[PDB]
């Protein structure tokens, strides 16, 4: 096969692929690799236009969502951060394959472990301490929530970077952040 | 891929720079066409700053403030295989490495251009 079936990503160097506050104002790099019952993931978000380049005084949190259908296929509409033309699928070289994902449930957060109505349960969250712009003097928290913004028979991933309250007038960018979760299949 | 290798364009203040980026598409390249031009200025220390895009069959600009309203795609038909751009009224602040990224899943290509701007029009 020309592609790797254990990896789903946004390609390593995606162009602005999110319209968070305004049209294409952010670059979200996300790579998910399946390793048995656990998916090793790495996420990164950076502002490139609008308010995401100069954190508003009243903002305290910046987050993105990724909703998947019952087959583990991304749905490119609200609230999914990635715009519809955004690249997402199996890895093939430094790009993605155009083949539809047929083993998506292997990358989805286990609904038994993280039930859809359990988004507020600690177990459905992986919270860590990280640093804005990688600057160790600017600590923030990244909270990954599983299946919290899911429809029904669906799945989701939520990334919440909080504590931005006192980093006003600065560009928003996160370092490469790691996370993991138990797979559906 | 792109038809031109990494080059260096030396121009003078006031002039306009034509940055080439012509590409060819394979039958395999079926993903949506994606063009992104980035810049690594010489003055400040920022790198890979977005300049202009061609995403979802639409042009998006005004990402790099210091370059506002002076960057436009030269071709009137991007899809045809030309992602070249212009930088009107060149200034000394415009010096840096400009990168052209042409993607069409699974295809991907990129070119780097070192733009140099001289105060007085002379390269002898």
């Amino acid at each position: 096969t020309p592609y790797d079936p254990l990896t789903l990503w946004t390609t390593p160097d995606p162009p602005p692929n999110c319209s968070l506050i305004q049209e294409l104002d952010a670059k979200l790099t996300l790579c998910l690799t399946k390793n048995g019952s656990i998916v090793n993931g790495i996420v990164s978000l950076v502002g490139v236009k609008g308010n995401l380049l100069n954190i508003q005084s009243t903002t305290t949190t910046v987050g993105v969502h990724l909703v998947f259908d019952e087959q583990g296929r991304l749905i490119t509409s609200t609230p999914t951060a990635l715009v519809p033309q955004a690249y997402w699928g199996y890895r093939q070289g430094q790009s993605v394959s155009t083949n539809t994902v047929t083993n998506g449930l292997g990358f989805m957060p286990n609904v038994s472990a993280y039930p859809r109505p359990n988004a507020s349960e600690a177990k459905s969250q992986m919270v860590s301490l990280t640093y804005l712009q990688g600057d160790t003097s600017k600590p923030i928290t990244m909270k990954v929530a599983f299946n919290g913004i899911t429809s029904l028979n669906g799945y989701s991933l939520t990334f919440m970077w909080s504590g931005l309250s006192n980093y006003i007038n600065q560009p928003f960018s996160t370092p490469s952040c790691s996370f993991s979760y138990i797979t559906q299949e | 891929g792109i038809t031109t290798p990494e080059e260096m364009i030396e121009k003078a203040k006031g002039e306009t720079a034509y940055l080439p980026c012509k590409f060819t598409l394979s039958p395999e390249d079926q993903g949506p066409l994606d063009i992104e031009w980035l810049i690594s200025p010489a003055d400040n220390q920022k790198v890979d700053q977005v300049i202009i895009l061609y995403s979802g069959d639409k042009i998006y600009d005004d990402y790099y403030p210091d370059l506002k309203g002076r960057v436009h795609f030269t071709s009137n038909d991007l899809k045809s295989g030309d992602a070249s751009i212009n930088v009107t009224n060149l200034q000394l602040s415009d010096i840096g490495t400009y990168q052209c990224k042409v993607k069409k899943a699974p295809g991907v290509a990129n070119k780097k251009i070192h733009l140099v701007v001289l105060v007085k029009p002379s390269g002898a």
Side-chain angles (χ1 to χ4, degrees):
Chain A
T1 177
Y3 62 81
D4 174 22
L6 300 178
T7 299
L8 292 194
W9 69 357
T10 58
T11 75
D13 64 307
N17 47 9
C18 301
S19 299
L20 306 181
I21 304 173
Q22 67 176 68
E23 291 302 85
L24 302 175
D25 62 348
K27 291 181 175 181
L28 173 70
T29 316
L30 181 74
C31 184
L32 308 177
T33 64
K34 183 186 181 62
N35 171 46
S37 298
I38 293 181
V39 159
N40 286 301
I42 303 178
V43 68
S44 180
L45 181 61
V46 54
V48 298
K49 193 176 189 176
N51 303 314
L52 287 173
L53 282 172
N54 193 59
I55 297 176
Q56 301 302 297
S57 67
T58 66
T59 62
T60 69
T61 317
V62 167
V64 293
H65 297 92
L66 291 170
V67 181
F68 306 76
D69 57 36
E70 48 170 344
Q71 284 304 302
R73 301 200 231 78
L74 182 63
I75 302 168
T76 53
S77 65
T78 301
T80 293
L82 292 172
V83 299
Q85 74 269 41
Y87 284 29
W88 175 261
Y90 302 119
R91 165 176 188 174
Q92 191 179 306
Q94 301 304 315
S95 181
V96 290
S97 162
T98 53
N99 296 194
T100 62
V101 179
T102 62
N103 65 331
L105 297 185
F107 304 79
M108 301 297 103
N110 190 292
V111 292
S112 290
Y114 322 112
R116 307 198 171 71
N118 294 43
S120 285
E121 295 299 294
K123 179 183 177 180
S124 289
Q125 299 159 46
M126 189 166 271
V127 200
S128 59
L129 180 75
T130 191
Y131 303 82
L132 186 70
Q133 309 151 187
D135 178 1
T136 58
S137 67
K138 304 174 176 176
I140 52 174
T141 48
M142 176 181 91
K143 180 183 287 196
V144 188
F146 310 125
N147 301 319
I149 184 73
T150 175
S151 53
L152 270 188
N153 309 307
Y155 305 88
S156 80
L157 280 170
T158 298
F159 303 92
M160 233 61 238
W161 283 281
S162 203
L164 311 171
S165 173
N166 55 316
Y167 299 123
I168 309 171
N169 205 66
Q170 304 182 43
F172 178 83
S173 61
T174 70
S176 281
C177 304
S178 60
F179 67 105
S180 46
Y181 52 85
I182 302 180
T183 69
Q184 179 51 35
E185 293 194 346
Chain B
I2 302 175
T3 65
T4 46
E6 190 172 306
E7 63 179 299
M8 184 187 128
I9 296 172
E10 200 182 64
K11 301 209 75 62
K13 178 178 185 174
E15 311 185 313
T16 293
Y18 170 68
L19 278 43
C21 198
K22 287 162 167 289
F23 62 93
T24 61
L25 299 172
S26 303
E28 293 68 65
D29 307 330
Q30 303 191 300
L33 179 60
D34 189 306
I35 311 296
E36 173 188 38
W37 274 88
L38 303 83
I39 182 181
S40 279
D43 38 30
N44 60 253
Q45 51 195 301
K46 304 181 291 181
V47 299
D48 292 16
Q49 302 294 284
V50 189
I51 306 171
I52 188 165
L53 312 165
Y54 181 62
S55 184
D57 305 68
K58 292 180 177 175
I59 309 294
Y60 296 81
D61 55 42
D62 303 320
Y63 278 83
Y64 196 62
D66 297 302
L67 214 56
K68 183 177 183 175
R70 302 191 289 122
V71 181
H72 321 79
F73 285 96
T74 73
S75 182
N76 60 310
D77 192 2
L78 272 284
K79 301 174 182 172
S80 74
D82 191 304
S84 306
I85 59 167
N86 281 309
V87 186
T88 62
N89 193 187
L90 288 169
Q91 291 150 48
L92 294 184
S93 68
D94 297 322
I95 302 173
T97 299
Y98 292 65
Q99 173 174 43
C100 174
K101 294 189 180 181
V102 181
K103 303 173 186 174
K104 187 156 173 59
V108 54
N110 63 295
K111 174 190 182 184
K112 283 180 180 62
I113 297 173
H114 292 66
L115 177 58
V116 177
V117 182
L118 303 178
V119 286
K120 299 172 184 178
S122 188

